[PDB]
Structures are given as structure tokens and as C-alpha cells.
Design a binder for this molecule. Structure first.
Ligand SMILES: O=P([O-])(O)O[C@H]1O[C@H](COP(=O)(O)O)[C@@H](O)[C@H](O)[C@H]1O
Ligand SMILES: [Mg+2]
Length: 448
């Protein structure tokens, strides 16, 4: 067989059977053989096993003559940022992001924080690790501790005009992951009044694993916003490369609408820029990008496709509906911090609530949300859907699965690249009734 921890985009498995210190050391050795010359940045999240896995990675890297730059406990985006900023050969973040207690993992990047994925080196590393029975060598390179965050913090703050910010009251919910450290380092430089929820880093996760999409976790941010009259609320996953927004009513804002909102915010600073978006939900993003004078660029779903497209297009911003936001100035990488700073600046400058910034867009382009289906035969299920709709002659696009545009409504239906699932997204032109009837019709076809 093959090591199951090696996934499409990263390494993730249960400790110690799928991932352990020995495997981590072998990954470090194998990674050294894949990178161009230079040092390697290492960081880790709040999980209990994360430091020991990073230490093993470092031991393997240094046995292979790689200098290591230890940036310590951090968010994933800090590995991306420091890898690029320090002109490193590559970087590894030790993290399980949002997963359970017995699980950990790694996200690997090369120069300029370019992704290393299954077909761009990650499976090559897997195969090297799988066959490596060599004795651990001893270190031939050094490790340096670089825990200064100053350049990262300055970079984050450079996205906003601090003189235009208003003293908004913001709920912030780190979910006992790592985001609170950065909020607290940014706070002396911002006028906001923070209401801190689940703020302390705690790898035992007393308040639940850090996954703001779980309704019970969602409600903790919503309640804090409502009870404190906050302007909005922000929650992060554990490694804080995703952020999640709650308006002043406590309503969680579906991520689709943030792509168009953030695109408009960025285009005010970089006029005429290209904006990359995914194919799942599109109409609102295309319109808002064009209305702000930008050029929208359709791209297959997945961070590696989006980053590659942004690079080839010099795109200023790219966004996925699923809370991933990528910024050219940030080494084309995703940040869970830049988005809320941009939104706080937009609320401050415009005098409009976050609710009102999105309300008309949500009415104009209602969407189903991503609905997942585990079916007996995905290919037969997809064929049942396409046969049912054939007589309507939709405009079809195979950029990523099947996109079908019927005029007043459209869907995207695709197989996940990460799990054996079918994923459905539907949207309409301002018609909630059509959205529901079509979503239910497709759902019935898929399950039949
Ligand atoms: O959810 P994550 O953090 O693993 O995120 C990863 O998988 C997601 C879902 O991919 P798919 O729909 O093909 O399964 C991608 O959108 C995302 O860019 C990628 O970083
Ligand atoms: Mg994450």
C-alpha cells in the first residue's frame, strides 16, 4: 500500500500510527532532497504533539545539511510569510488545522511559499519516506530561533489606512487555537475594542476542536456578538488560515459573499486588478469584481490551482467560497488575518454595517451552500443529473466537475479532490424558490 497520511495537498494522520516522530524526521530528509538550496522555515500550531514533530523534522533537515529557521508557535500563514520574506528554500507548518485530538499533520511549501502538493513533490516525498530504511544521520547544519513577528505584523497592518479606522467593537474567537496571539500583538496598533472569546491557546481544546463551521462552535461567536452589541465577530480555525464572519445580528455570513466583498475592498487599493475565483459559486463574484473595475478570472477549485493562476495573471486577490483568501502581496498565500482587517476598514470607511454590505448581494444571488453527497456510484449519480436536465440545454463548463448554467440558475457538481464525495453548489438570479426546488431536485437525483 502507501502511507495514508500523504493526502492531495498536505500530510495529515492520526498520531502515532499514521504520523510520528520517525516519519517526521524521514520527511525532513526527503524534503531536503526536493528543494532548491537555502534554509527551511519551521513553525507549529497549538496541538500537544506539534513541537515534537517539528523537532523531528528539524533533525532530518539538519542531518541533510539544511539550516533551519524555527519560527516557533505560529499560524500557518506565518510559515508562508516567513518562507517568502526570509528568501528560504521552503517551509513546513506542523498543524492538524481543524481535526481531532489524536491527529496532526504538515503543510509544505518551497520557494516563495509555493505549494508542494501530491503531483508537485509531495508524493515524491512520500515514496522516498516509504522506502527510507537508512540510519538517521547526525546534524550537519544549525537551527536558529527567529520568533520576531515584527515584519509579519507590519505587513498585515499595511493593508489598511490606520487613520481611517473607527473604534469598532469586534468579537474575536480563537477557539483556543493560535489566533489570539496575533490579535493581541495587533491590538496596540488598532482602535478596536475587542471582546475575546475562547482566547487562550490550549491544545486540549476545552471548548471543542477549533472548527467554526460546527453549529455549536458557531453559536459561541454569535452569542458574544449579540450580547455585547458588537459591530461584528470573527472566528478562526486552529491554525488561523481561515476566518469566519458574524454580522451585528449574530448571523454567520456564508463565505461565498466574502469573495466579492474582499475583492471590492482590494480593488480600491489596486485598481484594474485581476481577481481569481473558483467555479463553484461565481455570479456574485464576477459582478462585484467588474463593478469595482477588476477583471475576474475563473480557476479550478483548490489552493494550488488558485495560487498558480494568480501568479500567471498577476492577480491581486483570489478567493474561494470556503473561507480561503489569497493575496498577491502576501506571497500569493492565504491569510486568516488580512480579511478581517480589510472588512474592519470597509465598515469603518463606509459607515455601513457588515450586514448591509452583504445583504443585497445575498438577496441578488442566493446560494444553496456546499452540499456533500456520499453515494454508491458518483459517476452514475452525475449521469442521472445530466440526463434529467439535458432537454433544457444548459451551457456546460468542465473547468472543474460540471458547471451547468440554465440562465436564471446554475449549479456546479464535482468530485472532491480530497475525499470520495460529490459536492453540489447551486445559485439563482434573485429567486429563493427556484433555488430550493432545483437544489431538492438535484439532491433527489443524486441520492436515487
Ligand atoms: O479543507 P482543506 O483545508 O483541506 O482545503 C483544501 O481542500 C479544499 C477542498 O477541496 P475539495 O473540494 O476538492 O475536496 C480546497 O478548496 C482548498 O483550497 C484546499 O486548501
Ligand atoms: Mg486551517
Amino acid at each position: 500500500m502507501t502511507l495514508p497520511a500523504f493526502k492531495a495537498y498536505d500530510i495529515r494522520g492520526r498520531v502515532p500510527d499514521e504520523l510520528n516522530e520517525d516519519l517526521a524526521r524521514r520527511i525532513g530528509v526527503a524534503l531536503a532532497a526536493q528543494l532548491d538550496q537555502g534554509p527551511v522555515v519551521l513553525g507549529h500550531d497549538v496541538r500537544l504533539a506539534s513541537p515534537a514533530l517539528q523537532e523531528a523534522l528539524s533533525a532530518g533537515l539538519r542531518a541533510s545539511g539544511r539550516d533551519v529557521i524555527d519560527i516557533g508557535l505560529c499560524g500557518t500563514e506565518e510559515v508562508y510569510f516567513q518562507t517568502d520574506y526570509l528568501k528560504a528554500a521552503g517551509g513546513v507548518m506542523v498543524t492538524a488545522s481543524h481535526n481531532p485530538m489524536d491527529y496532526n499533520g504538515m503543510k509544505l511549501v518551497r520557494e516563495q511559499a509555493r505549494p508542494i502538493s501530491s503531483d508537485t513533490g509531495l508524493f515524491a516525498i512520500r515514496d522516498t519516506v516509504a522506502a527510507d530504511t537508512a540510519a538517521p544521520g547526525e546534524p550537519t547544519a544549525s537551527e536558529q530561533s527567529r520568533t520576531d513577528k515584527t515584519a509579519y505584523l507590519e505587513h498585515l497592518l499595511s493593508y489598511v489606512d490606520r487613520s481611517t479606522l473607527k473604534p469598532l467593537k469586534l468579537v474575536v474567537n480563537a477557539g483556543n487555537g493560535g489566533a489570539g496571539l496575533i490579535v493581541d500583538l495587533l491590538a496596540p496598533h488598532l482602535p478596536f475594542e475587542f471582546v475575546r472569546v475562547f482566547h487562550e491557546p490550549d491544545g486540549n481544546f476545552p471548548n471543542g476542536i477549533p472548527n467554526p463551521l460546527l453549529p455549536e462552535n458557531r453559536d459561541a461567536t454569535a452569542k458574544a456578538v449579540k450580547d455585547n452589541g458588537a459591530d461584528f465577530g470573527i472566528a478562526w480555525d486552529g491554525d488561523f488560515d481561515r476566518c469566519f464572519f458574524f454580522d451585528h445580528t449574530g448571523r454567520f455570513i456564508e463565505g461565498y459573499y466574502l469573495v466579492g466583498l474582499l475583492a471590492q475592498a482590494i480593488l480600491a487599493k489596486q485598481p484594474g486588478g485581476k481577481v481569481v475565483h473558483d467555479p463553484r459559486l461565481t455570479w456574485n463574484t464576477v459582478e462585484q469584481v467588474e463593478e469595482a473595475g477588476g477583471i475576474p478570472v475563473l480557476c479550478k477549485s483548490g489552493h494550488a490551482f488558485i495560487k498558480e493562476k494568480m501568479r500567471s495573471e498577476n492577480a491581486v486577490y483570489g478567493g474561494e467560497m470556503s473561507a480561503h483568501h489569497y493575496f498577491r502581496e502576501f506571497a500569493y498565500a492565504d491569510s486568516g488575518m488580512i480579511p478581517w482587517l480589510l472588512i474592519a476598514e470597509l465598515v469603518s470607511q463606509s459607515g455601513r454595517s457588515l450586514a448591509d454590505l452583504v445583504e443585497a448581494r445575498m438577496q441578488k444571488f442566493p446560494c444553496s451552500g456546499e452540499i456533500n453527497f456520499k453515494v454508491a456510484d458518483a459517476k452514475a449519480s452525475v449521469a442521472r443529473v445530466m440526463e434529467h436536465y439535458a432537454s433544457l440545454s444548459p451551457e456546460l463548463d468542465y473547468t472543474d466537475g460540471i458547471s451547468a448554467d440554465f440562465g436564471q440558475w446554475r449549479f456546479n457538481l464535482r468530485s472532491s479532490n480530497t475525499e470520495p464525495l460529490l459536492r453540489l453548489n447551486v445559485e439563482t438570479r434573485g429567486d429563493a424558490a427556484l433555488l430550493e426546488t432545483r437544489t431538492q431536485e438535484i439532491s433527489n437525483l443524486l441520492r436515487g
